[model samples]
Target: FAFVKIASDGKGFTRYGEPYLIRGANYWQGMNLGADDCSGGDRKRMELEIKQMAEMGINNLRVMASSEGPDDQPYRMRPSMMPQPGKYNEGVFVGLDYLLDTMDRYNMTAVMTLGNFWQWSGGFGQYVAWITGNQTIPYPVGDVTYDEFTQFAARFYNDSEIAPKANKLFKDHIYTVQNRRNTVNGKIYKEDPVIMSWQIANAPQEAPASWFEEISTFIKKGAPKHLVSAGLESKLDEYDFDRAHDHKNIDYTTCHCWVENWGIYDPADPDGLPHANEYMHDFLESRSKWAAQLNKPIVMEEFGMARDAWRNPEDETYKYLPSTPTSHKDEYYQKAFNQIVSLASNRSFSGSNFWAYGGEGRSTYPPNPYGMVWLGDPPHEPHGWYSVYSNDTTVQIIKDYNANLLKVQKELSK
Candidate 1:
């Protein structure tokens, strides 16, 4: 028997001992969610990179199941994952059980995501249609009451409740389920134990209020086999989080942030909080406070720097990872993520999952991966520091912080 988040000091944010700081890397590929589009499918490629991450002291997987790949510069999805209306493709995650099984092998746990934090992976499922073959119309669900929204979504996830659990849109109600047993027609559901946590989305708060209630309820009532968490971004304020926490079904909180120091000299320069550090301090403080109030463990689901920072055109390494020249952009990425880890791990954060691994996109790739960009061997300054250690100053920096996490973990025991 496993506890979704029970058996500890009743805290999910802090890893049992003192404060646990999770070190992680993204595992998303730079392409659409299409299955056939993926480079080696989710398992083969993700499994390989995960091994690389384990060697680096990472314990969490910030799986990025995003929704905007079809709209990015090169809109597309993997052939196998050819997204369909009101339906998710299993081919994309066909061997996902194996991936999670591998995580179990490494004492690692996965945070499963249902959607993206951007417009596509947003809480408002029907908000946009470009990727889903729809248009940029407003929320199609109409201005119904929260109760009505939850009910409607229940039906939407499954036409007639054919599925074992309702694929709730948000992450509230479903969060409370903790390893409950159920047998229908001599078959069991929600029985997977290797799963460390269930990820609803990246920063689920960006999702509407109705979604929160529906997803939290469904996951709690149906899954009930593991921890329930949100892939919420820091954009969420305390008020929104409280709703999720109070759900009783909910067990933990997750945050995704890109708070780095990207502004004028001072933070109060009227230009508003600097691009980088603007939310770092505040986010950490708020997380500490929120976790304590909700009495639920909190983890940082996904957070990192954007490749846009290091645009050194003159530098061959600045070439984008997917383009003909393979634009290099190692220098800028080094600093962005470094600051992120330093500030985040210093708090009550339970753990973290990077944006993704492989397949974000490929200039010449036929069946490209989704969410992750490539950084293979042969060392190119243009490609970030994924496969090598040359210009990946950020990776080296986080490696040090990851070591600090062990120290933090030990200190908590006292």
Candidate 2:
């Protein structure tokens, strides 16, 4: 099996000596669905979803390769692979093996994220809380502001007393995953061609360049055949972006766009829809130039807009219901996809993996207060918020863009 590699020019990717582009979606809950005992496990559904994605022309998937637990953690993915420090849940790891084997069978690749900065997966904050015995670590729920929770999670990057221990635990988890043999296919993870890269984390907020370099180098040492990435959100500034991806060990750059979360768009405001296209255009243009300067490929690894049904902002269930219309979202995706394909033609942009693909999974109407389903949205967010459902017009847009992307890749190879 040929490994995916950075092209000689240092600006794109190649597999089997042909130019490759990642037309992908974030299927973060894949492992959970692959497991038998996990709360969200549904192997049959997992197989069907992957088949659906592959048939839609999606060639890559971004998935969570790690999750933590004490299972009672608020909003965290349950039946975590790591229920405690240095402890292992063999079942979830087997589930991951099944996921990779399934993907390999479908001729799909994956970008596996090793850890997360957020608490949705019992990430950095959970580690810090575990080490310090601070059971009351602030969660970004009703009363705890996001900033408050962030400040605490950010401690995993810099705190003198806690950072070292937490970092070791994270590294151990990475090592465990990297060396494991696939229980299904009997292939070692580091040698599997189905996995294109090993990401450091899912948006490691406020982590310094030094930390990125250290962790990425550690991964490279263990899995030298695979590519590595920081998994940072695109900040659109020299200092922030450079600190995250401009390192020797980091093979490529990643950008995550959230129009609503960043205040660039408001689904509730009629005037907000137009601004999203403009914002996404400028974001791609700027990030492309920056990535060119660093001589590395850049991927819009995550991006999404809410469904158009924003009539009742306070009604969380209705706003993100799978049945809601997606007129605005379809337009947004088309525009973003256009920009991505155009940039890929010139080799300035590598590819894109949309925020998510929620196939056959629908948000419960009343909304399950305890999230145990695998929707496109993570456990922390409203179930259907950024999910690209099978019935959405966005699916056609993605299928169209993926075809265009292949055309661009073929032309580039010429």
Candidate 3:
């Protein structure tokens, strides 16, 4: 497991001299652990989680590498890396050190994101609020339009009164992680094979396209060997995805599909539920074709469906309300996996990273006020909404797909 690089043809990736297709999950809170800690905050727990994930044929993990916050602020997941401006918590960062070390031992490659788009991680808007003297984040928890919200968060991109500090902080964090030597292996992150890519942020703002180039260039300057990604959602409305993905400095393209969020599929529409799978299949294929035209690889870095219905903590079994059913979510995984297997022969379609993996992770505050939760997959998402547990059949589906992918890869190699 050395650094993964784009294939010679620029349509896939190779690692250790073999073609690599990502079989991954979003483990944003992979750094958060402990009864009350949010950074996974404990080394031993993170190591255990890594071992479990490795056993399941998961070789790639997408992790949140940083969280910005003032210690007193009520952000989503706490124990922020930088508790205050220019001040960081050693314990929290060391936890990430432990995470990377464990991943290295297990041969797990990480897509380490440096920032976030939502409040769960005290993202860009928090920085905007910090420098602009606006104590409140207007988008994450408020009634706001996408334009209005991204515009507010886009302050990080606008080189205004706030951009200088925000940009400096991001660069500092990148420099720290890029050069920080792991205590376990005593290897600098730049030299560590544990990381597959250094993502700019989780769905960075819909702002000037130059922001992508600027941030990516800065990262490449600091850490030349590793791959860099814009971490854009690739949403047509939010970003110039065509231009964003075409950047020469960006190694690949990424897109996220949220059936519910985009309002394309509704649990309420049972008849239409069957079509959701076909819809997503087309959506992914179209995007894959677009990426191929750009002569780059593409990864479906995020896509998930909630359980048939929201659950009540007191109930032992999942409840299927009239609005939601228990049958469709898993079907979605099956369809997505089927498509992935088909795409295995299509080099441009790299693979997928499910929304999350919540192996033995329970909510610190369970019985969420919202009734049911998907644990803290997104930290801010509804609890018990989209996480894939070890026992869930979806894990078996993913494992099965990896098995098929291996068989297909063998064939493709011929």
Candidate 4:
């Protein structure tokens, strides 16, 4: 197959002149695995992980294409793609090249998110800090509240004209990644078959619909072959889809679910699990209805719960046996997966992928020993918190559900 694109009349994806059902996971850290040298996690580890994912029925991956921050910046994830404004990192490019090449061999495609909204990779906040000449980040750094932090990041969409420096920083980064070339394979990124789409940003909030339209249009005009998405998390109560997804330049819509993030679930109380599960079901059903109404295929791109209080997979000798008792996390996964698969079979939904996957990677405490490296992304989240690992009993739950979901898709196709 060449590359995946929107199917006829914006149904699902199509490759080799046939409709495609996306089965995917978010592999955001794939682009910077080996850091500056591009040698640590490629070839062996990546291939193994991708092959494993394929076998478990994942054909598409929402991977991170950009990780930016100055090398001297503290409290940030490194191997920055943009070490300095308008500058490119050759090693990171090579690492991405190898990633795309390897995925091609496995018959997989990627929804490559261009950047993050959070502090994980020195995202929008870093850009704000840079234009202002502040080595210490502005929001929530020492005493700033989260509300202030959001107002800072939302400046990219709220009013770029008011903050020309920040707007320029945003535009330069976008142009650099969208038009970059691979140093190792010599393939133009815009022409690469391995990339399924170019996402504007991950989990963005409060950006005007016009921002999505402008940027999406910009990328589509420059790279006519690839698809573009807003990467909006669909904070339904506070989000505006018509302003974002309804734009002509955006090919599809994406929605994410998190009980805690939404303030509807409390992991500390198992009794809340049932109520949380109900809320989740309603959220997805509503999104499906919205997608159908708009005639646009939607991907429930991210949703995952933390490990239950009873089990800590990071224990040195801990192992996930098939007989492990029912945990709240497992129950939630099964329910969510079932609902998503049912929608794909009957509604306008394209597919669903969990928040993250950490296959066989051990947790190395960064700043806190209790933190699990396998679970969280840098500069903030505790380690080993959200990832579904290879040995977890949830793996079997996912594998079985994926197999069943693909079977349903095949039947529907026929």
Candidate 5:
């Protein structure tokens, strides 16, 4: 019953045994849940979300470290501009610790992602958070030539000596609170009470497999008491899938599906088709096959459309930044969710976690709080008008869907 045991493999694949699949979405930002540019990291908000999630049956959460990435703002910087290693925004910690506590309190496991949401892997910068919405600044900080970054690293880290600046960034950011054992600033992960698995940088598909190889190494060395896995994207990208899956430190290979570029591309109409279910099915199928090839456990860390069902009703600029209409969304969503569960069962994989939960009175541009369930005060749960999983009814919708699905799976298994 307790899925808290660490995997036998060197990699971290917290085993709860084959349970139909624990599903849920990726809870965003810390506090206001990205309610606005000026607001973030409100402990009260996070605690409520965790309580609501337990009610929703969401067993896993993908928590992030910093809001910015090496390629994105606030975090944006030419390699030369990057802060020295060991030097990172310490401000996020107080909030992060609060987040860790919330998860621990609820007995929910977190797929702690130690990176910005931009690609979660290390690629992205086009979309801006609420604060950076306006102002069309020329040339992204990412535009800072790779040469500039190389020089920056040379000047800061590899140069004469390691610049405390670059050292801070590298030492701190490269390693996570979980990856370093004794706990960064005295913060250690609660394995028994809370923690499904420690992750490599989220979807770092392009970073050499060796990058994950090192991450896997650090986690094992530091959190010897936990499970590990390459938090890589769903499909096979440039990174060495075999090598990553093979890494002694990587217990199982995990996935984050942005299926068919569903939410990533412009929505064709009211529905989000030319949808993602098919791609999701394909993604799962491939991973199943691949896992079979590697004989490893599987955990799909992230996947799902906007709360408004393919409409991306969250971001006011949804129409601008890839979206699927509401029409086809239902069909595709049902299909995708169903298939995701089915495939996980067939493969006897560890589990899968949806994109996120919560969307009450939550709205940056008023009426549309986007992916959230509502946009009111704390506990902004389902309001019925436009629910992603259900109009608050989905708590049972998912349960019924999975329960019978599991029954059928066992039947077929025999």
Candidate 6:
């Protein structure tokens, strides 16, 4: 059980001197599903899901390893691991321990994201609200715009008064996670090879480049054996990607692709399907150039397309149904996988992890109460928006793509 490492040449990943191209999926709610105490948790489901993923050639998982809470915030994940600044919910830790142990048993690794820039996890906003003694943090749920909520969350990184305290709290939480022992397997987290890397946050935005380097260095100091990543996306224009990832401690760079969100493709518009591939190609090419310039491997850690009927005015409910056709999603995955595999052969591009895998978990159309079943989609989004279900054709695409990716990995290793 050796830790994954940057290849000697810094162009890809290696485990025990063999090239490891990540074929992974996001399972942000792994801990939640593993914990019986947490909302929507079902340990049995977690076990079965991981087994399904392993059988499908998914070797890595990007998971939400952190959550903050007062437990009552709208659109936020409840039963937070850290309900308060210094206090913790040990039950959640138990769940996380179980998750890591399960992944270990399945021989699957995880990219553990430590923090978030958004409110769905009671992330930066909760920290700011705590310090300010204001429980009523504006959530981007009903009336509040994302800009307003983002401005509030960004205070954790930019505000002179808030940044210091918020960052300290985050670092303390990181320390706790890094030093804790997994109750299930009796292995210290930092010493466990089941974790592939410690991600700074999930798509952190509006932060200074110095923050990335500082946090990355801090994580490296605490867990020298593990790799560190900033978990950044391509959407941020305020942060310089190169400067943020330039530090030696930053083992690799990351980018997320959101074709629908970025307006490059519209699942509702049949005419847009053909052009979506063109847009995906351009985006990956640009990212590949960034990786080449940085001289480090780059992972498309998150990319997803909605089910085929998404946004169809005529059939709104059908779009979110588990039985809905995934032809558009299949096409999107094929294009993205083809590009990623092609890039891996020549450039610093390494691999990709699709947005999510929601095996056997079905979301009720209108969403069930506060604790909806854990889909690939987070609490803030409609259930099943971009989740890849077990029966979807997208699963076959992922399986086939992994086969092709492994072939390239072997060629590159030689």
**What are the root-mean-square deviations of the candidates from the true structure over C-alphas?**
8.8, 1.7, 3.9, 3.8, 8.2, 1.8
Task: List ranges where model 1 is wrong by over 4 Å.
Answer: 1-7, 13-21, 29-44, 64-76, 80-82, 85-90, 117-189, 205-210, 260-275, 307-347, 356-391
**Relative to the unseen true structure, what is the C-alpha lDDT of residue 160 in candidate 3, on a scale of 0 to 100?**
69
Please give the distance, in angstroms, between residue 238's alpha carbon in candidate 3 and its true position after superposition: 12
Give lDDT: candidate 4, residue 60.
85
lDDT computed for candidate 6: 0.85
Please, what are the lDDT tens digits per residue for candidate 3 over residues 100-133?
7777788889898988766777888788887787
- Overlapping backbone residue pairs in candidate 1 total 74
> Model 4 over residues 1-414: C-alpha lDDT tens digits?
477777777657677766566777877766655333332343466667777788788888888777666866655555567777777777766677777777777888889887778777778777777776775665465677777878876765565553567666667777776677766667788888888889988888767776787788888887889889889877665247666788888988888888876688766554668877998898888887776666778898888876664454354222222233337778898988888778777746777777777765644434322121423344455455566766777778778777867776676567
- lDDT ranking of the models: 2, 6, 3, 4, 5, 1
Top TM-score: which candidate number? 2
Badly placed stretches (over 4 Å) of model 3 are 34-44, 142-147, 237-239, 310-326, 363-376
Using all chains and alpha carbons, the TM-scores for the candidates as numbered come to 0.63, 0.97, 0.89, 0.89, 0.66, 0.96
Model 2 ranges with Cα > 4 A deviation: 37-39, 311-316, 365-371
Candidate 2 residue 269 Cα shift, in angstroms, is 1.7
Clash statistics: count for each candidate = 74, 0, 14, 4, 56, 0
Of 2 and 6, which scores higher on TM-score? 2
Error of 2 at 13 (Å): 0.4
Write one digit per residue (lDDT tens) for candidate 1, span 339-393. 4344443444555544433332232344223333333311111244233322333
Candidate achieving the largest lDDT: 2
Distance from true location, Cα of 225 in model 6, Å: 0.5
lDDT-best of 2 and 5:
2
- Model 5 residue 81 lDDT score: 15
Model 5: weakest 10-residue lDDT segment is: 75-84
Residue 78, candidate 4: C-alpha displacement in angstroms = 1.3
